[PDB]
Design a protein around this nucleic acid. Structure first.
Ligand code: K
Ligand code: K
Ligand code: K
Ligand code: K
Ligand code: MG
Ligand code: MG
Ligand code: MG
Ligand code: MG
Ligand code: MG
Ligand code: MG
Ligand code: MG
Ligand code: MG
Ligand code: MG
Ligand code: MG
Ligand code: MG
Ligand code: MG
Ligand code: MG
Ligand code: MG
Ligand code: MG
Ligand code: MG
Ligand code: MG
Ligand code: MG
Ligand code: MG
Ligand code: MG
Ligand code: MG
Ligand code: MG
Ligand code: MG
Ligand code: MG
Ligand code: MG
Ligand code: MG
Ligand code: MG
Ligand code: MG
Ligand code: MG
Ligand code: MG
Ligand code: MG
Ligand code: MG
Ligand code: MG
Ligand code: MG
Ligand code: MG
Ligand code: MG
Lengths: 343, 328, 81, 208, 132
RNA sequence: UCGCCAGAGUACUACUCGCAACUGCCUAAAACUCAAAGGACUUGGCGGUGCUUCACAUCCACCUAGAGGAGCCUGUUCUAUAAUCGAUAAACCCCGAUAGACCUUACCAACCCUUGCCAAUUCAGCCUAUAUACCGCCAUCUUCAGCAAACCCUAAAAAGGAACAAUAGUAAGCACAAUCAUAGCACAUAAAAACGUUAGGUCAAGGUGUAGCUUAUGGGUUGGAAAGAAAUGGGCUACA
RNA sequence: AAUGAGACA
């Protein structure tokens, strides 16, 4: 029955059954990963159960200048050699069950907040080791096809940043999740924004914007209290470099709109120097802990206007009801003042 | 890949020297045709694909034409149309259009001076001139083209060629001209043969539907045909079969002016009758003037019949008929 | 850009793409063009043949002088040391 | 089809080539036939330049053939023309002075004339409209009328003939019957005219 | 769809050698026969014995050289001597190759009662014809 | 500035006030049930939707020879016997079989054998169950032209990506194409035909996952699987 | 030309 035997690749290609019709449209819900074991991982050409020492294969051909001859092995010696092989195989099994504990994202199973390392180098040889990327949203996308039917595709939305004020985002979609990450990282560095940071810890002024159907409001904060924002905003803020911010999200909480709305609002930020130039007047910062000391932070380069600003007795500004309610001390929710973990 | 080509060139010359040394010929005249017959002998590869046989030729002819480097060390492109995607095609278009303006400008000056010294040389019908094929043109510009681009380029040449032609322009145009082979349907008239005091006898070959006929016609005898040593009337009882033999002779009005002996083997009665008919038509071309030979072709006498019995496909009752198809 | 519009009266793709690649553009803009993305717009006429020829010649001498005066200073630099 | 699109139908008539100088346009037709170097198909076995053949006879001979017996079909057609000739010769002898130069003794003339009287003038084709079929008369083309006349001749002599009477003699009788406008085939032709005339108001259904 | 001795297309990351890259209908058109002998001629006998011996060598050479075999063997039968041509990767030390060469030549000669020739050509890795 | 809106179904309903209404109008809940209901959009399929164009064995018009009727041969279903299995819309039905008197043979009835083919083995052996675990080898849409990977674009991207007097796409891989075979070419026929669809067919070519048997679902000997009430498919010979 | 789908994501 020697002719009845087959090749190792043929046997494993059939035993695994990873090419049939079961694994096409989710028909196979086994959920247990069948593992293929290479039976040639441990090989000693010449070694056998009977224990024959063939000169040339296992034992050296020449011993002390004399060529060895064919010889057998002692029963006790052969037992020890066989005991060595089985322990090696048991060790291999122990090194396969264990799995590397990946970085903990926003949760234990989602990919939100998981870093993928530095982006791939550009075609010109430029290397980006300072940039870091984070995953914001992974979602399976299905499409209806004439032949296959449900064509499952994976799209991801990642953001990159160096921590010095430059960051960007992009979306990458492919048939495989592994290929999806690669496309998202490379296309991210092509779209980069520069977000001005007042003293490299906070935005210059409070920002209120409405991107499509997403209402996001951000407020300036001192150095002590920082990074109290949406868990997706915190991921972007750490990449940009902002370390003190408060943000409240109202309306739709879609990840794509929130990311676009945040960058659009931050890219529209106005600095003190620009405000001084367009007004031709000095801007004075009144620190509360420094008393009534008039610290000057920016000066209008060029002509200085001698005409003071017209003082309006009652300013005409649009106030948000949430801001006034909190200021007067009427927000008594059981979630606003809760103690949380570190930033 | 310039260096790789250079390495192939030098070792091919060295390899040619070794082949000449082992073949025992003169290495100075070891031509490519000699190399092909030498390789076909040392390595007798039996394969039906003509391109799959072992080859050893000039690396320039083997390796496809490669694009040269388009920019210097500083990155500046050498040509001024490199940013158009297809520099070679558009440069040719730019030069071709520029020649048209120069011809128009030159013709305008000639009209001002009241002189017309140019003539239309587009008509090259006796030579058999045809424009470049798209595949041939792509191998001249070393760049891929499209059907829309090819048609535009050819039509532009027609405008250039329809204008008065200059000496420089014709040299430019003639690079885009190709000559077709000689086209003719005249047959080769076999000269008459004389043998052992026999005058005006010719031999013809005919074959139709697995039946080969050998007919030799004597121009000095009366009207009779001897097939396989027996009279044609006995050998062809069917009226239709004997009508086939009449068809060549009757068309030439020489039914009784030729004595023939025939030898036909294989096939049925009609296959032999058709084969003998074809052989006589080819054999009688020697005795007939050239003008009526053309008339012979127009009647279908000289054209062999390509209709042969087809095979039987596996899974079918016959050559085309299939088994009964029960829908349910 | 001697003409910022294509043959279908739409803004040229190169105008938008150049801004993406951060490439400054000097283009002649007609009365129906969009000078928003062009960093050095030149409001003028791009249809009459005399206008088009004038712009080409002006950029011919501007380039030639730049090429020549680059060479003249290089010659002076070579004899400096 | 082993013949490509370039191949054309050969010309067989010898007289077409022997007198070309009396016309100019026809000269341009065949001088360019070979000047264009167009290939010519092989001569068919059935057709020949013999002056004693006739195209209508070959088509009629082919239809009578069953299976692949061309010799038997040719033999039957030969006897049928002979059978008609014998009957016409016999009737000529037993005739008066004025009757002698009335009878036609040419079987080819009789055969050509017989078919030209059995051809229907207007045919019928079913048309589906409103879930029902209406027999709508149509002006059948010449080739269809010529083909239909031959089929009626073959169908009549094959079906309602006696077992003893031979095929060549039975067909000979019908040719004479059709030559006098009194054969059953002529009756069948009139019957098709009866149905076509009755449905004369349904001709508006057809759209061609 | 035909599946006899074919490798299916899977993106462009799986290398294929020349033998495996051609469908079986290309035999005698693009690639020759891996074995040549007189048994399958027109009027020659002794065809079944050659076939079974051929199959055994396909299984013996594959197991004698585990992993280091590149592709299929080539078997040539001249007179009564048997020639085996193989492509072997650079896996075993040259001492082991000569040991196996001597072991194979002697064992097969005394089993089929005919002289055996074993010629080896060594390549750095499997030769790739398409994809990759 | 006024009116109206607090998940869906129950509900333009029950009860209540007013009304020339009396099967009515207006006002308008709850018990209970569900974890959704609902707006817009994208691709695909489909349409007894419209417009234009087209079927060279093809749908109609139309050509020739046949099946369905009878005998016989053979294959299924049903009937029958103690007495296989598998195929069984197109893609089953002279099919696995280019092949069964014993053998083959896997079926039945009896009668024997328990390291029971091999060098060894607390192991050999299984035509035992699972084609819904599979490799192999195919059917099929199909002589349909589209599939897949790299990359770019879209005031966002579910997805889509062409205008030649060109308006966002690019170059390669597979398939078609070309080439090769049928001893000239041509034509024609063969051969080819990707990614997928039908959990299509095949544990009974063979191998093998999982489950089962182990003095028995294993091995051997002898004898025997009859029979056609009836129905049907594909064929041969005819009805001259 | 009326009807049909169950334990496929
Ligand atoms: K659609
Ligand atoms: K039948
Ligand atoms: K038995
Ligand atoms: K099994
Ligand atoms: Mg399968
Ligand atoms: Mg967890
Ligand atoms: Mg939500
Ligand atoms: Mg037939
Ligand atoms: Mg204008
Ligand atoms: Mg609300
Ligand atoms: Mg409710
Ligand atoms: Mg109502
Ligand atoms: Mg009511
Ligand atoms: Mg109430
Ligand atoms: Mg049909
Ligand atoms: Mg019959
Ligand atoms: Mg019957
Ligand atoms: Mg029957
Ligand atoms: Mg059965
Ligand atoms: Mg069954
Ligand atoms: Mg059993
Ligand atoms: Mg299946
Ligand atoms: Mg949109
Ligand atoms: Mg592509
Ligand atoms: Mg192509
Ligand atoms: Mg050929
Ligand atoms: Mg062909
Ligand atoms: Mg085929
Ligand atoms: Mg092909
Ligand atoms: Mg199934
Ligand atoms: Mg089915
Ligand atoms: Mg089944
Ligand atoms: Mg088994
Ligand atoms: Mg079974
Ligand atoms: Mg098993
Ligand atoms: Mg038993
Ligand atoms: Mg019946
Ligand atoms: Mg059949
Ligand atoms: Mg008989
Ligand atoms: Mg019902």
């Amino acid at each position: 029955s020697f002719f009845t035997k087959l090749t190792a690749d043929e046997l494993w290609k059939g035993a695994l059954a990873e090419s049939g019709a079961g694994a096409r449209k989710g028909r196979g819900k086994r959920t247990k990963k069948k593992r293929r074991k290479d039976l040639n991982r441990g090989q000693i050409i010449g070694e056998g159960r009977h224990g024959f020492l063939w000169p040339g294969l296992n034992i050296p051909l020449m011993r002390n200048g004399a060529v060895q001859t064919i010889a057998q092995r002692s029963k006790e010696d052969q037992e020890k050699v066989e005991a060595d092989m089985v322990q090696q195989r048991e060790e291999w099994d122990r090194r396969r069950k264990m799995k590397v504990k990946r970085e903990r994202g926003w949760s234990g199973n989602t990919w939100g907040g998981v870093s993928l390392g530095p982006p791939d180098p550009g075609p010109n040889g430029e290397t980006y080791d300072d940039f870091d990327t984070r995953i914001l949203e992974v979602r399976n996308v299905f499409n209806m096809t004439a032949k296959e039917g449900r064509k499952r595709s994976v799209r991801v939305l990642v953001a990159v940043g160096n921590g010095k004020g430059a960051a960007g985002f992009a979306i990458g979609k492919a048939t495989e999740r592994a290929d999806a990450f690669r496309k998202a990282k490379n296309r991210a560095v092509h779209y980069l924004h520069y977000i001005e940071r007042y003293e490299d810890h906070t935005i210059y002024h409070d920002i209120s914007l409405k991107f499509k159907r997403t209402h996001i409001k951000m407020k300036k904060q001192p150095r002590g209290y920082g990074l109290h924002c949406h868990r997706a905003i915190m991921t972007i803020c750490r990449l940009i470099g902002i370390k003190d911010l408060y943000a409240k999200v109202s309306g739709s909480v879609n990840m794509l709109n929130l990311t676009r709305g945040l960058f659009l609002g931050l890219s529209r930020q106005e600095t003190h120097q620009q405000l001084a130039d367009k007004k031709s007047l000095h801007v004075v910062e009144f620190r509360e802990e420094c008393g009534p000391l008039p610290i000057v932070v920016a000066s209008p380069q060029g002509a200085l206007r001698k005409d003071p600003e017209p003082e309006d007795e009652v300013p005409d500004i649009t106030l948000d009801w949430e801001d006034v309610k909190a200021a007067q001390g009427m927000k008594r929710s059981v979630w606003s003042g809760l103690k949380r973990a570190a930033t | 890949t310039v260096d790789f080509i250079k390495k192939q060139i030098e070792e091919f010359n060295i390899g040619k020297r070794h082949l000449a040394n082992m073949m025992g010929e003169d290495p100075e005249t070891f031509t490519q045709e000699d190399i092909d017959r030498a390789i076909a002998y040392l390595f007798p590869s039996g394969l039906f694909e003509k391109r799959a046989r072992p080859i050893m030729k000039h690396p320039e002819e083997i390796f496809p034409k490669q694009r040269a480097i388009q920019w210097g060390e500083d990155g500046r492109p050498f040509h001024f149309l490199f940013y158009t995607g297809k520099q070679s095609y558009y440069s040719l278009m730019h030069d071709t259009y520029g020649k048209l303006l120069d011809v128009e400008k030159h013709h305008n000056q000639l009209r001002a001076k009241d002189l017309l010294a140019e003539k239309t040389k587009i008509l090259k019908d006796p030579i058999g001139s045809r424009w470049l094929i798209k595949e041939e043109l792509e191998e001249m510009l070393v760049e891929k083209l499209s059907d829309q681009d090819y048609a535009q380029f050819i039509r532009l040449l027609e405008r250039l060629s329809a204008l008065p032609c200059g000496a420089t322009e014709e040299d430019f145009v003639n690079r885009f001209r190709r000559s077709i082979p000689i086209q003719s349907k005249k047959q080769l008239i076999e000269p008459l043969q004389y043998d052992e005091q026999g005058m005006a006898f010719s031999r013809g070959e005919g074959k139709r539907k697995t039946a080969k006929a050998e007919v030799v016609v004597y121009g000095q005898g009366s009207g009779r045909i001897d097939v396989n040593g027996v009279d044609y009337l006995l050998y062809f009882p069917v009226t239709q079969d004997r009508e086939q033999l009449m068809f060549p002779l009757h068309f030439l009005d020489r039914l009784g002016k030729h004595d023939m002996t025939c030898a036909v083997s294989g096939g049925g009665r009609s296959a032999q009758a058709g084969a003998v008919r074809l052989a006589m038509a080819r054999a009688l071309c020697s005795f007939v003037t050239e003008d009526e030979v053309e008339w012979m072709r127009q009647a279908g006498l000289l054209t062999a019949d390509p209709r042969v019995r087809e095979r039987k496909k596996p899974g079918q009752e016959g050559a085309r008929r299939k088994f009964t198809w029960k829908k349910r | 850009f001697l003409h910022t519009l294509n043959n279908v009266f739409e803004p040229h793709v190169a105008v938008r793409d150049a801004a993406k690649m951060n490439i400054p553009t000097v283009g002649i803009v007609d009365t129906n063009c969009n000078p928003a993305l062009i960093t050095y717009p030149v409001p003028g006429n791009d249809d009459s043949p005399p206008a088009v020829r004038l712009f080409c010649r002006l950029f011919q001498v501007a380039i030639s002088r730049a090429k020549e005066k680059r060479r003249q200073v290089e010659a002076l630099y070579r004899l400096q040391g | 089809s082993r013949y490509g699109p370039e191949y054309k139908d050969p010309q067989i008539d010898k007289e077409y080539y022997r007198k070309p100088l009396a016309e100019q346009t026809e000269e341009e037709k065949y001088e360019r036939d070979f000047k264009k170097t167009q290939l010519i198909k092989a001569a068919p076995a059935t057709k020949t330049s013999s002056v004693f053949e006739d195209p209508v006879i070959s088509k009629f001979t082919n239809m009578m053939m069953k299976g692949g017996n061309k010799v038997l079909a040719r033999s039957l057609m030969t006897q049928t023309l002979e059978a008609v000739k014998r009957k016409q010769f016999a009737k000529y002898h037993a005739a008066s002075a004025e009757e002698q130069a009335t009878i036609e003794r040419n079987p080819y003339t009789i055969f050509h004339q017989a078919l030209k009287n059995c051809e229907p003038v207007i045919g019928l084709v079913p048309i589906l409209k409103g879930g029902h079929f209406y027999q709508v008369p149509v002006p059948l083309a010449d080739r269809r009328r010529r083909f239909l006349a031959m089929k009626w001749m073959i169908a009549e002599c094959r079906e309602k003939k006696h077992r003893r009477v031979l095929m060549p003699e039975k067909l000979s009788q019908e040719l004479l019957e059709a030559f006098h406008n009194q054969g059953p085939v002529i009756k069948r032709k009139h019957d098709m005219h009866k149905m076509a005339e009755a449905n004369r108001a349904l001709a508006h259904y057809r759209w061609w | 769809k035909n599946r006899a001795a074919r490798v299916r297309v899977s993106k462009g990351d799986k290398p294929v050698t020349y033998e495996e890259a051609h469908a079986p209908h290309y035999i005698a058109h693009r690639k020759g026969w891996l074995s040549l002998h007189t048994g399958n001629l027109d009027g020659e006998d002794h065809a079944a014995e050659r076939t079974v011996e051929d199959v055994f060598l396909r299984k013996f050479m594959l197991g004698t050289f585990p992993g280091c075999l590149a592709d299929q063997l080539v078997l040539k039968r001249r007179a009564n001597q048997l020639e085996i041509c193989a492509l072997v990767l650079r896996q075993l030390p040259p001492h082991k190759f000569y040991f196996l060469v001597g072991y194979s030549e002697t064992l097969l000669s005394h089993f089929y009662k005919c002289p055996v020739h074993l010629h080896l050509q060594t390549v750095p890795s499997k030769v790739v014809y398409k994809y990759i």
